[PDB]
Amino acid sequence: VLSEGEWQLVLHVWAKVEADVAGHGQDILIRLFKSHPETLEKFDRFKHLKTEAEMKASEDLKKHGVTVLTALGAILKKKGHHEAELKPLAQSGATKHKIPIKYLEFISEAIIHVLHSRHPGDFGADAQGAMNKALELFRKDIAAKYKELGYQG
Ligand code: HEM
């Protein structure tokens, strides 16, 4: 659980993300694929992208990043009260895409990296701490939903 001031730091930087959801979405996916290339194997229509520039020119990738960040934002705004919003992600992660929690740690690292690269002035230690706790809670609660659906990833 996060304190009310921790949630405000999370939503404060998140408001900055929403000034450019598409570009943040692209930088996060690209950072994920580069840091942890195994993750790119989950995306059938994205593994023909061989270069950073090709990934940025792909409209489908950009659209996907907005879909990912929109869902994540809607969860964060619930400040922990996110069972209704989380359940559909658990279901497709556990029953369709098979996305292990380690891969959610990978994209969590990418999110922190890009937030610090773009917003250092609104993402110092305390805000990094708060966002870390929020994503930790996200992963903890999706793991528990994964197991209720019979996925141990
Ligand atoms: C912050 C964490 C994440 C969020 C909020 C998120 C959200 C979403 C949403 C909203 C969709 C479309 C709906 C559905 O299928 O559920 C999607 C699809 C997808 N996700 Fe995730 N995702 C996350 C992390 C990941 C990671 C870490 C992987 C892989 C390494 C992944 C792989 C996929 C794939 C393969 C699809 C299907 C895409 C298609 O080809 O149209 N996701 N995700």
UniProtKB/Swiss-Prot annotation:
EC number assigned by the record? 1.7.-.-, 1.11.1.-
Q: Which domain of life is it from?
A: Eukaryota
Which InterPro entries does UniProt cross-reference here? Globin, Globin-like_sf, Myoglobin
Q: Which residues does O2 bind?
A: 64
Catalytic activity reads: Fe(III)-heme b-[protein] + nitric oxide + H2O = Fe(II)-heme b-[protein] + nitrite + 2 H(+); H2O2 + AH2 = A + 2 H2O
Listed PROSITE patterns = GLOBIN (PS01033)
A single GO molecular function term of this UniProt record:
oxygen binding
Checking PANTHER family in the record gives: MYOGLOBIN (PTHR47132:SF1)
* Protein task: Monomeric heme protein which primary function is to store oxygen and facilitate its diffusion within muscle tissues. Reversibly binds oxygen through a pentacoordinated heme iron and enables its timely and efficient release as needed during periods of heightened demand. Depending on the oxidative conditions of tissues and cells, and in addition to its ability to bind oxygen, it also has a nitrite reductase activity whereby it regulates the production of bioactive nitric oxide.
What name does UniProt use for this protein?
A: Myoglobin
Q: Which gene encodes it?
A: MB
